[PDB]
Design a protein around this ligand. Structure first.
Ligand SMILES: *[C@@H]1O[C@H](CO)[C@@H](O[C@@H]2O[C@H](CO)[C@@H](O[C@@H]3O[C@H](CO[C@H]4O[C@H](CO[C@H]5O[C@H](CO)[C@@H](O)[C@H](O)[C@@H]5O[C@H]5O[C@H](CO)[C@@H](O)[C@H](O)[C@@H]5O)[C@@H](O)[C@H](O[C@H]5O[C@H](CO)[C@@H](O)[C@H](O)[C@@H]5O)[C@@H]4O)[C@@H](O)[C@H](O[C@H]4O[C@H](CO)[C@@H](O)[C@H](O)[C@@H]4O[C@H]4O[C@H](CO)[C@@H](O)[C@H](O)[C@@H]4O[C@H]4O[C@H](CO)[C@@H](O)[C@H](O)[C@@H]4O)[C@@H]3O)[C@H](O)[C@H]2NC(C)=O)[C@H](O)[C@H]1NC(C)=O
Ligand SMILES: *[C@@H]1O[C@H](CO)[C@@H](O[C@@H]2O[C@H](CO)[C@@H](O[C@@H]3O[C@H](CO[C@H]4O[C@H](CO[C@H]5O[C@H](CO)[C@@H](O)[C@H](O)[C@@H]5O[C@H]5O[C@H](CO)[C@@H](O)[C@H](O)[C@@H]5O)[C@@H](O)[C@H](O[C@H]5O[C@H](CO)[C@@H](O)[C@H](O)[C@@H]5O)[C@@H]4O)[C@@H](O)[C@H](O[C@H]4O[C@H](CO)[C@@H](O)[C@H](O)[C@@H]4O[C@H]4O[C@H](CO)[C@@H](O)[C@H](O)[C@@H]4O[C@H]4O[C@H](CO)[C@@H](O)[C@H](O)[C@@H]4O)[C@@H]3O)[C@H](O)[C@H]2NC(C)=O)[C@H](O)[C@H]1NC(C)=O
Ligand SMILES: *[C@@H]1O[C@H](CO)[C@@H](O)[C@H](O)[C@H]1NC(C)=O
Ligand SMILES: *[C@@H]1O[C@H](CO)[C@@H](O)[C@H](O)[C@H]1NC(C)=O
Ligand SMILES: *[C@@H]1O[C@H](CO)[C@@H](O)[C@H](O)[C@H]1NC(C)=O
Ligand SMILES: *[C@@H]1O[C@H](CO)[C@@H](O)[C@H](O)[C@H]1NC(C)=O
Ligand SMILES: *[C@@H]1O[C@H](CO)[C@@H](O)[C@H](O)[C@H]1NC(C)=O
Ligand SMILES: *[C@@H]1O[C@H](CO)[C@@H](O)[C@H](O)[C@H]1NC(C)=O
Ligand SMILES: *[C@@H]1O[C@H](CO)[C@@H](O)[C@H](O)[C@H]1NC(C)=O
Ligand code: NA
Lengths: 339, 97, 272, 28, 49, 272
């Protein structure tokens, strides 16, 4: 699926190179490659910052006011954990493969069985898959991911991530959340309270104030987590606190981290496509890039009618084309390969 | 190097990570927090395509997965009787990290 | 055995002393052990005198080498409460010691107790001003490294540009004291070689020269380190005072022993 | 209790910024 | 900052909104010339006591 | 004369060639001049043969040394238009040359004309992968230094982590070729020494060994640089192709001359 995204961007670059070759027949290889790379980078930045971020944070960057040469844009250590966790909390147990005519095809397993969707845990580092053989299969992957709803933005992880993540050493499987916790301890990440204080967030003094709606319900995860920490809120780590904070959105800590990191990335970059001083694009080219969404990239690469995809492929709404058959769970999918 | 919002939190204040018994076992914390039923739809109807596009954006931005030199191991001690990694109650299973 | 990482999980050892001094001690103790093994092969009554001669010569050589390489000429040590690191308002109670040698200075920061603020405070840092080595570069690398505040303070006190002129005088003193100590070592080697030869009076003269050069190095170090304008080293609520360390006194004692033995040799030759 | 309850500012401008220790320092 | 600068620039700093850890505060090369010249243009021939 | 600064206002000179090659040439030309001065002292008819022997031996030694130290084994050169520096969209028309030797690579960027964009473009940068030297550190220092873009591109092409495996194969080839060239130099020294001695057949055998080791170094360089996966070096609108440089051909010619002379010596000894 990450591979499908990479293939999408690779084919988009090739398509832009072909377009520029059509427009400028006299251009050589280097000129075509550089112009296509510039355009693709601009489109990627626009989609990532002005379309994906507002949809997956419910927060928008402030209006671009120019290039800040004195602003450090380096990725913060907290951003790694925040982004990784608020993405891992939404990984589905399976992924649909969808036709351009709103038809969800069956997925041929390596066990020769036909499943309703492609199981995530059994597709890690897949050298080859029987249902993934041609460009049409990758297009089906992209369409199905566009039509399928992700998992809930909560503390719960699917077993494909929590138990069957690719083990990098001596085990074919490992816990991705435990690995992320050990990464946060490895990077010397701050405590949850210190992280909140450094970002200007309001201090949290009680364990039930981490997520009021979570403590309202019958879920006992807050009390159990406090028991693990010996009721010491000052020892709660940034990553578990960000996991617990999330409710319908990344928590205030994680949302603040990601938003501030992306603000610094946009403002501190001299090659940002909106920075008119770098000479990358004219005003008209900047306006064209701003008008380009991921739906445009998918339509251009897959070469299908625009009505086959919703206008904002990052969010599915009632009335959008090709609804998913049902919310995927572990039921009906192949069992994950044992460690 | 990566930036820091807060000064680094290490056991020795330089490079040694904070771990047990001061902090809970990573697998215990994972089991306590992340165990739950699959199939809970996103409350904003966010799509899977968006999730993996964000994964692509992260791969574009940061990468701290490849190990460093000299090889230092911060191994995850699996609690005895873990249903997934220690099903035989052997009590010495260790996930290498 | 495998299946676990790392294969060796034990803490890695740290050498318990200076490696140069340890090597000198090992070499000269090996020579002493060899000559002790050889001792029964010595002929007759001239064994205790032979033992004294051999042990004295080896001690003179070891003293020359160790003193020339010891950073223990000007020593000082004060127990204080001081700020420890950056981005931390907590203070540490520690012994801060200055050990200025011929080629540089060792700054020691030993916690009392060593385990304070969940950290091991047993720093022993060297900053060298030897010819060809840039002291300012070493101090800049220490600043980049992030050494604790007392260490950085005492290191910048010896920078070439520091208002108190410790660097210039101490570099000059150490350089010429080391040169004259090397001359004394050469004279000691020649003293051994020419005590092997039948002309004992020339060997006694060379031993006398060894003593004279030791005394000259001592006097030059004293005079060149005395010309310093008073640099007040203030840590916390205390002031650190330096004084002639045991390297200075070992130089004095060894030089006096060498000059006394040379004078005795010359007078005995004149009287016999 | 120590009257100096804060981290004393350095005279050379080092360690003022958390990640850029040379910022504002002498010789930069 | 809050008395000399407003009086000698007729410009005021924006309201202080906190510490910016990711902002480079290093003196720019242009600032040397700018400050030195707008100060040197006002040096009097003499000074009263 | 004073009263002005600086006392010398002239541009400072730059040495017009490689200092190692220049030193080798100077030393061997000095030896040649000394032996030419000595030539009238040679006895009789055995002067032209003596001259040929001396000049041939000196040429063999100079070839060994210069080739071992020349960064001219794999050479390439292309004229292109390329981006020059950062924060500047202007391009330069220049000859970019790659000169891979045994211990490293010299990247040359010569402007056409040299004076372009109000700058002198005559860069000749070396990046060394010799044992004990860190190529990645040198490339990082070049990046910090701010070298022009073609130089940085061709330098990163030889980094250990670059996707095209030029670094590994070229380091191995250069290391072992240099080792065998040093062996050939030792054999040449022994060939001279044992041609001084009455046993001429052994000296001829040593000369033959010199030739054999030169050929072995040549063959090893060829084989180890042939195992490279094709690294496409693309600058601007062109591709740079490397080929065996004049160091390779001088190695071949000198080794063939040495093996031919050794075979001639052995066959003449057998026939006389
Ligand atoms: C005059 O002064 C002279 C100069 O000191 C003196 O000569 C010196 O003599 C001593 C012997 O008496 C020798 O120097 C010592 O050597 C020891 C061993 O050196 C090897 O190991 C170190 C350790 O590296 C590990 O850790 C670092 C991080 O700290 C990692 O980056 C490494 O990768 C490595 O990590 C692995 O191993 C760890 C082991 O537990 C694992 O935990 C980890 O997971 C990894 O597996 C290496 O760094 C050394 O390499 C360096 O040097 C070589 C050659 O110079 C370089 O090529 C290389 O690039 C490196 O630069 C080497 O391999 C050192 O351990 C010891 O260092 C301590 O002391 C010095 C001096 O005070 C400090 O600067 C240094 O930071 C260390 O102090 C800390 O640690 C000690 C205990 O470990 C504490 O007591 C101390 O308070 C301080 O603690 C603080 O930091 C800790 C983290 O670092 C933290 O945990 C604490 O809480 C606290 O904050 C020392 O250098 C050597 O012979 C001479 N030194 C030279 C030549 O430089 C001379 O005797 C003096 N004269 C007289 C008369 O006294
Ligand atoms: C394989 O490769 C090997 C490596 O190259 C090669 O071995 C090398 O051989 C050559 C001889 O053939 C030797 O290297 C050369 O040495 C020359 C002399 O070196 C001395 O002088 C330099 C100059 O320093 C002055 O300028 C700098 C700024 O540039 C100042 O920082 C200095 O303070 C000094 O300034 C004073 O003098 C100026 C003179 O006009 C005044 O104007 C000024 O006001 C001041 O009064 C010193 O830097 C040298 O010191 C350095 O090295 C020592 C020892 O290593 C260190 O201790 C020390 O710290 C320094 O690091 C030394 O004192 C060099 O001039 C020459 O450098 C040029 O070429 C190299 C390689 O391309 C470049 O990297 C370098 O930048 C220079 O290129 C610029 O300048 C030339 C002409 O000057 C241009 O043609 C060129 O295009 C480039 O111009 C660009 O920059 C200019 C500004 O720099 C700018 O004006 C232009 O417009 C343009 O932008 C070179 O290094 C030496 O023997 C070997 N090199 C080694 C060992 O490093 C080997 O032969 C090769 N093999 C084969 C087979 O070919
Ligand atoms: C897939 O879509 C195409 C047209 O988009 C349609 O012709 C085809 O029948 C569909 N596949 C199936 C299995 O119905
Ligand atoms: C961008 O889209 C808006 C409306 O969606 C349109 O008014 C505008 O002309 C477009 N600009 C470009 C450059 O395509
Ligand atoms: C979210 O998607 C489901 C189908 O998975 C649909 O029934 C529901 O109406 C959607 N909600 C919104 C607000 O679009
Ligand atoms: C350091 O502080 C401790 C406790 O605050 C005190 O007992 C001790 O006397 C202090 N030492 C010095 C040298 O001030
Ligand atoms: C720090 O030191 C205190 C007291 O010496 C000790 O109780 C604690 O376990 C140590 N470690 C941490 C992480 O606080
Ligand atoms: C470089 O540019 C000049 C002028 O633009 C042109 O004449 C020349 O052919 C170009 N060379 C290459 C190799 O493209
Ligand atoms: C730069 O080059 C141009 C043309 O070669 C020349 O006229 C000019 O004097 C040079 N110097 C500057 C500062 O422009
Ligand atoms: Na979830």
């Amino acid at each position: 699926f990450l591979q499908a995204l990479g293939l999408l961007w690779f084919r988009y670059h090739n398509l832009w190179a072909q377009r520029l070759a059509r427009q400028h027949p006299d251009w050589e290889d280097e000129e075509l490659f550089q112009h296509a790379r510039k355009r693709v980078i601009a489109t990627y930045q626009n989609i990532a910052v002005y379309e994906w971020l507002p949809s997956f944070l419910q927060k928008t960057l402030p209006e671009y006011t120019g290039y800040r040469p004195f602003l450090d844009p380096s990725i913060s250590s907290e951003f790694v954990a925040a982004s990784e966790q608020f993405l891992s909390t939404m990984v589905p147990p399976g992924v649909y493969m969808r036709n351009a005519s709103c038809h969800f095809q069956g997925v041929i397993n390596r066990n020769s069985s036909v499943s309703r969707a492609l199981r995530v845990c059994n597709s890690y580092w897949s050298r080859e898959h029987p249902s993934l053989q041609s460009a049409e299969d990758v297009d089906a992957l992209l369409l199905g991911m566009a039509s399928q709803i992700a998992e809930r933005e909560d503390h719960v992880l699917v077993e494909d991530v929590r138990d069957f993540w690719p083990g990098p050493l001596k085990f074919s499987r490992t816990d991705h959340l435990a690995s992320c916790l050990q990464r946060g301890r490895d990077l010397g990440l701050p405590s949850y309270t210190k992280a909140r204080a450094a970002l200007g967030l309001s201090p949290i003094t009680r364990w039930q104030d981490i997520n009021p709606a979570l403590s309202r319900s019958n879920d006992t995860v807050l009390e159990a987590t406090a028991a693990l920490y010996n009721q010491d809120l000052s020892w709660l780590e940034l990553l578990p606190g960000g996991l617990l904070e999330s409710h319908r959105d990344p928590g205030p800590l994680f949302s603040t981290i990601v938003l501030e990191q992306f603000v610094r990335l946009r403002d501190g970059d001299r090659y940002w496509f909106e920075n008119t001083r770098n000479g990358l694009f004219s005003k008209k080219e900047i306006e064209e890039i701003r008008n380009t969404t991921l739906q445009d990239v998918l339509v251009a690469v897959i070469n299908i009618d625009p009505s086959a995809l919703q206008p904002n492929v990052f969010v599915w709404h009632k009335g959008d084309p090709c609804p998913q058959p049902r919310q995927l769970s572990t039921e009906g999918l192949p069992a994950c390969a044992p460690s | 190097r990566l930036q820091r919002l807060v000064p680094a939190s290490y056991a020795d204040g330089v490079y040694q990570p904070l771990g047990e018994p001061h902090l809970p076992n990573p697998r215990d914390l994972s089991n306590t927090i992340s165990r739950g039923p699959a199939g809970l739809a996103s409350l904003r109807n966010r799509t899977v395509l968006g999730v993996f596009f964000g994964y692509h954006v992260l791969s574009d931005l940061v990468s701290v997965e490849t190990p460093g030199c000299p090889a230092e191991f911060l191994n995850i001690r699996i609690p005895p009787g873990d249903p997934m990694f220690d099903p035989d109650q052997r009590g010495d299973v260790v996930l290498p990290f | 055995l495998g299946h676990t990482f790392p294969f060796y999980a034990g803490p890695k050892p740290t050498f318990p002393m200076d490696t140069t001094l340890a090597s000198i001690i090992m070499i000269f103790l090996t020579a002493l052990a060899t000559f002790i093994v050889i001792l029964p092969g010595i002929r007759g009554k001239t064994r205790l005198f032979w033992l004294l001669r051999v042990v004295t010569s080896l001690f003179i050589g070891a003293a020359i080498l160790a003193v020339n390489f010891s950073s223990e000429w000007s020593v000082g040590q004060v127990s204080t409460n001081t700020s420890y690191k950056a981005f931390s308002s907590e203070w540490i109670s520690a012994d801060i010691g200055l050990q200025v040698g011929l080629g540089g200075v060792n700054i020691t920061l030993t916690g009392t107790p060593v385990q304070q603020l969940n950290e091991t405070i047993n720093y022993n840092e060297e900053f060298t001003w030897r010819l060809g080595e840039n002291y300012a570069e070493e101090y800049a690398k220490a600043l980049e490294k992030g050494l604790p505040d007392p260490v950085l303070y005492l290191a910048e006190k010896f920078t070439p540009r520091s208002p108190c002129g410790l660097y210039r005088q101490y570099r000059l003193a150490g350089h010429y004291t080391s040169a004259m100590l090397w001359v004394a070592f050469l004279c000691w080697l020649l003293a051994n070689v020419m005590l092997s030869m039948p002309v004992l009076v020339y060997g006694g003269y060379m031993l006398l020269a060894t003593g004279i050069f030791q005394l000259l190095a001592l006097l030059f170090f004293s005079m060149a380190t005395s010309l310093t304008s008073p640099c007040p080293l203030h840590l916390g609520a205390s002031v650190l005072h330096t004084h002639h360390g045991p390297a200075f006194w070992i130089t004095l004692t060894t030089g006096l022993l060498c000059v006394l033995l040379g004078l005795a040799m010359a007078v005995a030759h004149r009287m016999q | 209790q120590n009257p100096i309850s804060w981290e004393v500012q350095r005279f050379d401008g080092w360690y003022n910024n958390l990640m850029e220790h040379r910022w504002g320092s002498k010789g930069s």
